[PDB]
């Protein structure tokens, strides 16, 4: 099926998405300047045709630098590259949506993005702070209105500034709010959520499939395990015994088995690496396949326990992870 040369899958709006992309979140204070640009360049040279980014990762200008350089030298055409950008919580006021996308286009120095998604379902205080809180450390929230935010997203598509619209960290209820919208013009085509053999999202995946929504697996290797966002008492995904033993069987690493697992089930994966060797390793997933028995055994690792619980926002009206899916 999938090959290095050819591994795009269809989206419900007629576009397509490369089933592996390069994730680009990196700790801003702990990351050298230019590491993102270089990594994007190396990934494109390796064969990646999808890059996942966000203004709030603080490096979208490096993403643009790299994509633009590779287009200028003729490695790829604009049409061959799929960039996904994200609308952060402080920018959900409908009047703010298109100017926020427009800023990302200017930062990238590109005419459109391939996919633009609502980054989380919660709205925070519009400001010059990504994570607004009072001196008391209390979180500065904003009342959400996902339907009105979505309408503003639709207008960006109508204007030609984005090919496909989608969402992230949305549960079934939140998806239905959009999908049941009176006057819905553009259905979401993607939901970007945590997904990997310890959290396989079986119900949310089946629900998305019911609506022709493709899941994009963020943290598909189990995260960088920063103690701020992940419980580092949870066992590291890449130390799993089955994943390592299947790696031995195929002379592949646990990482490669995890990535192959999700793509083989039609789940897009966006592993992040800023390491040239691991960027290449993570793309070498088209020269083997897992047997159905293997696939079953890996899905069986599903703990229905997430690494990314976002516990600091659990009180927000739109907190997505109280519901079972
Ligand atoms: N929409 C959202 O809410 C959301 C939230 C979180 C993440 N995401 C997106 O999804 C991307 C992926 O997730 P993530 O960055 O959290 O995590 P991840 O991709 O699951 O894991 C990345 C961690 O794994 C290391 N790594 C990469 N390849 C490896 C390999 N072959 N073997 C061993 N270690 C490897 C990386 O270090 P090196 O760089 O040194 O290789 C990094 O520390 C993000 O960068 C972002 O684009 C979206
Ligand atoms: C992107 C983000 C900050 C970075 C977080 C991400 C959740 C997952 C996470 C796992 C880590 O180990 C590193 C930090 C990251 C990558 C958060 C979700 C919303 C917040 O803005």
UniProtKB/Swiss-Prot annotation:
Annotated PROSITE patterns: ALDOKETO_REDUCTASE_1 (PS00798), ALDOKETO_REDUCTASE_2 (PS00062), ALDOKETO_REDUCTASE_3 (PS00063)
Ways its activity is controlled: Subject to inhibition by high substrate concentrations. Inhibited by testosterone concentrations above 10 uM. Inhibited by the primary and secondary bile acids chenodeoxycholic acid and ursodeoxycholic acid.
UniProt keyword Calcium, yes or no: no
Binding, substrate: 25, 57, 88, 119, 131, 229
Description of pH dependence: Optimum pH is 6.
One BP annotation, GO: digestion
Catalytic residues, chain numbering: 57
Cited Gene3D superfamilies: NADP-dependent oxidoreductase domain
Keywords: Bile acid catabolism, Cytoplasm, Disease variant, Intrahepatic cholestasis, Lipid degradation, Lipid metabolism, NADP, Oxidoreductase, Steroid metabolism
Function: Catalyzes the stereospecific NADPH-dependent reduction of the C4-C5 double bond of bile acid intermediates and steroid hormones carrying a delta(4)-3-one structure to yield an A/B cis-ring junction. This cis-configuration is crucial for bile acid biosynthesis and plays important roles in steroid metabolism. Capable of reducing a broad range of delta-(4)-3-ketosteroids from C18 (such as, 17beta-hydroxyestr-4-en-3-one) to C27 (such as, 7alpha-hydroxycholest-4-en-3-one).
Name of the protein: Aldo-keto reductase family 1 member D1
Gene assigned in the entry: AKR1D1
